[PDB]
């Protein structure tokens, strides 16, 4: 009947397919998205004696604490507007953790979801981080071949834990009585095709002539006269996830402003591509497969087409 | 740290509302209190596209029970896509509410947010399984009037967070539920919505059933004005999620006649008057392309109207393209 | 009518004008400090992470019982004379009302191991006020001599926190209990009008003390042990905790009784504090309360921190103590 | 912050215990975080004999809990005592049996209960012959692994040994989780504090009476001792562990042997007291030295210091 995060995961590690040192690590992430899941709520509460960001360092520690027995954790520290990530590296030497505390440092983005996310990678044999910390980590995480695990802690109306061990993925609800995760789904599949958009057609007019074409054939009555539906919440993990629920297409487009896209390669954009091409979607930067990108830079920007993959294939095409 | 109850206590005390009213308020709240956790549960609850209709349903139950003391509840059925409306009339019969347990019907728009709608009006006339049928249906809409016997409306938004707002005819005020605490705790006094916001809420996926009045109203905002800045879009699906987002941060939010739905989809009095009269409390503007939504008296039973509500400059605004 | 909560149930009151919109606030009040108080208790053991264990609690717990009648009025303390736990004053500002409020039951981590409570009582001064916590003793001379027990005490009740947090509730016309739900963080009336039995073979006494007490009570203590009518004798029950203790005995009948021994000359528990609203809630509860000879609401507060023996629980129970104690 | 799982895990990594049992342990605990809620709205719940069919919610909850683990079955009760559930692992290498709450009285279910559990490794309701077959697996002095016990009070507490000593865990109310609080916990060798219900004094042997007047008697200090009795087991047996003392509950005129189970509730509580450095006997010997020939049986029990349970039995010698 019910399965909790700590159940399935002894499951697959009697099964062999996770060590006990890896289960701990991915028991102790679910730790802290359970304390930041709290802070999240009571923001307003806590603020009585702007709040979006001064809660990503909170929960950055809170993070550090939780995994202090696998492994110390460092910070990069947000460049620009960013979100200051934690990377957390084992004692062992085995794992390394790349850790978002929230998808982002806006209150308007986060009024009404936001969420974690992380990513998890092996070294092969090569507080505040240094510029020789960040080259050596950028050079150690490539997430096309050495990224094992990843997933995202969503913060909404509900409070969802997705993850991927490299074999499709599940879908934990945390029940707020017995204050525990309850797998409420397995190897969850993002729909072929979606006439779904989530796109900011705010800055429409800062586009290219390609993807302005796009946008355009979406609001097309076709076949039937019904035209696509456009959803579009701010938050990454709340839009994302809604992608990979009910299907359709998600995108963070270069513009005139952003000539490179917003959305961070390494800590954003690679673990929620691992987790739509498990859930049977695609993940592109327009022209191709985010994965195979390797990071170069450390707050390394790239544009995003993630969702369907039939949706995907499509934008493709117009970019192309 | 002031609570809700605190505050309604307070109020009750300097003779803004009476002890009746007081109840009410405060019945509505624990309900609000219950439908919050099976929100959150829902998918566990599961575990034992309708699932958002079937959680309508214990919704409207548990407003029902939290109600008891107060007063029989009748219920609209949801002929459509609609949500099925509770309607609560006390055994005083000094006051009715209207209450929308969640926001939409939809699992696509309640994803990572939903809330409840209430109202409530004082009858200026007499009297009135669990469906309410066509005759009463009909008293209903002819007995609450918004423009003038509704007393006070709020929502409670269940989201990241679960905020409470309500306003009794002086000021809107924002209440955050404490989740250890199981109490709502008061966050904001008299909040009060921008003059302006650079963010506008609608669904672009119809722009090509819109009028070439509203193309241009549209179109014009995505011209990034000598600031450079354009204006930013958002929209989450949810009303209530859509609505409070405006209500903190400014903006317009908009739900306008096209030509699958000539008459627009959100309903006058279970939706668009709450909401209206709310908005017009924290300074802002609620309109339906041309007149105040509260000055439209509802005459038909599921009467639907087109919404522009916001800051107050940027509802004037769209009301001059479509001049 | 199916869901009564306490806030429901109070405003009905003030409607029956039984008590006014002023008092519903301070009850209302108290029952958010008691939700605040019943989590401190519950997580003591995690807050100790990052035996006097129950003497600081004491204390955080009267800070949270001044914040939340904030909005009534200003809160003074009476200190602890010897190991008493220290009493909490609320004056309102309208001196309307005035609260004595004891935060914990206790002060000992043995008797505190599985319950504790929060017991309180308001009063109707008839005389003066006093400033602005350790009140000094004119001022708690002044509040000795304004609380009248016996004529100007309006509501008491109490606040029993273990496997289940009730609070018990009189404001002058029966005794009523509400649970508080944990889900919805609210308090729901579970009973109306609770009567405590006439009768009931079950004594509350700390027979450790035995060679300390009287011969009367020797006595009655021996003749409790004789295997009555169907050779079934009497049951000893003993919490260690006055609000546990209490409890179980309004619910299931019997006896509880902290009479004075050769240490404790005049008992332990304190006149006004403990005794007082204890009392006035049992009477309403159609019981007895008394400290041997005279009913215990009889006697005056006349010292600061007076002491007490106490044989309160069923009516009829009591008086056959009493017939002893003659 | 050490969290029962953090903990669990790491015992499990450290080999002292396998991802089974670990997923056993884990899920007893997720069972006792329902049923503490179900005892916190019992009143409520009510609105919508109590202490009765509280016992079976409970039998349910904890089912519901190991069917990831095994198959569970009842062994329904004679009188008015607890039904206990017995839970098989699909595997066939545990036993687990659970006593759900620790009284069907009102009146000792008052401000405390809570549930006692038991797991042996052997080398709806259940019949006669299950029963008779359960008696001669779940061998305490042999086969006994682990055991603990949730206390539902003013607090709930999670007591657990898994054969290297006895740890407290603590329900934080915030986060849902049970928090470690205390390490190798010891019962002192002696403390002056006696639980017994002395309203069957004179139903209680010659012996056992001039023991309990003895208690009586202020010692060289002018000091006596001190009397507390809940009617809880679990409550009862958790105030003897913290602070020390003696428990008891001895065999009367009526009752030649006793009230307490010897498999369902003093078996598991005397092997945590002697992990705690204490003693359980039944007045004369060992209670892990007790083997059942029915599971229903009873037996005296006289639990808590190693010191003053010696001095019990000297005066029942």
Same mark, same amino acid.
């Given at each position: 009947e019910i399965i909790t995060l700590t159940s399935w995961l002894l499951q697959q590690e009697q099964k062999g397919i996770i060590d006990a040192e890896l289960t701990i690590v991915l028991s102790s992430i679910s730790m802290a998205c359970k304390q930041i899941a709290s802070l999240v709520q009571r923001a307003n509460i806590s603020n009585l004696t702007e709040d979006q960001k001064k809660l990503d360092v909170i929960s950055n520690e809170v993070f550090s604490n939780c995994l202090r027995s696998s492994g110390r954790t460092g910070i990069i520290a947000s460049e620009e507007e960013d979100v200051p990530v934690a990377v957390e590296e084992s004692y062992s030497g085995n794992y390394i953790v790349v850790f978002d505390? @929230? %998808?982002? #440092?806006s209150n308007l983005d986060a009024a009404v979801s936001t969420g974690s996310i992380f990513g998890i990678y092996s070294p092969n044999d090569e507080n505040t981080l240094g510029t020789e910390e960040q080259r050596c980590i950028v050079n150690v995480? $490539?997430?096309? #071949? /050495? @990224? !094992?695990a990843a997933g995202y802690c969503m913060y909404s109306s509900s409070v969802i834990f997705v993850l991927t061990i490299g074999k499709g993925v599940f879908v934990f609800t945390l029940d707020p009585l017995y204050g525990e995760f309850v797998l &409420?789904? +397995? /190897?969850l599949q993002i729909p072929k095709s979606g006439k779904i958009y989530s796109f900011n057609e705010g800055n429409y007019k800062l586009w290219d002539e390609n993807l302005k074409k796009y946008i355009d054939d979406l609001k097309e009555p076709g076949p039937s006269g019904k035209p696509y539906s456009a959803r579009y919440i701010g938050s990454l993990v709340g839009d994302f996830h809604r992608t990979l629920l009910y299907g359709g297409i998600y995108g963070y487009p270069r513009d005139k402003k952003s000539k490179n896209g917003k959305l961070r390669l390494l800590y954003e954009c690679a673990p929620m591509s691992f987790i739509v091409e498990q859930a049977g979607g695609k993940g592109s930067d327009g022209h191709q497969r985010? !994965? %195979?990108? $390797?990071? &170069? +830079?450390?707050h390394q920007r790239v544009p995003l087409y993630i969702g369907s993959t039939e949706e995907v294939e499509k934008v493709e095409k117009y970019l192309a």
């Open positions: 505390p @929230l %998808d982002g #440092s995480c $490539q997430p096309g #071949s /050495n @990224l !094992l &409420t789904q +397995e /190897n985010v !994965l %195979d990108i $390797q990071p &170069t +830079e450390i």
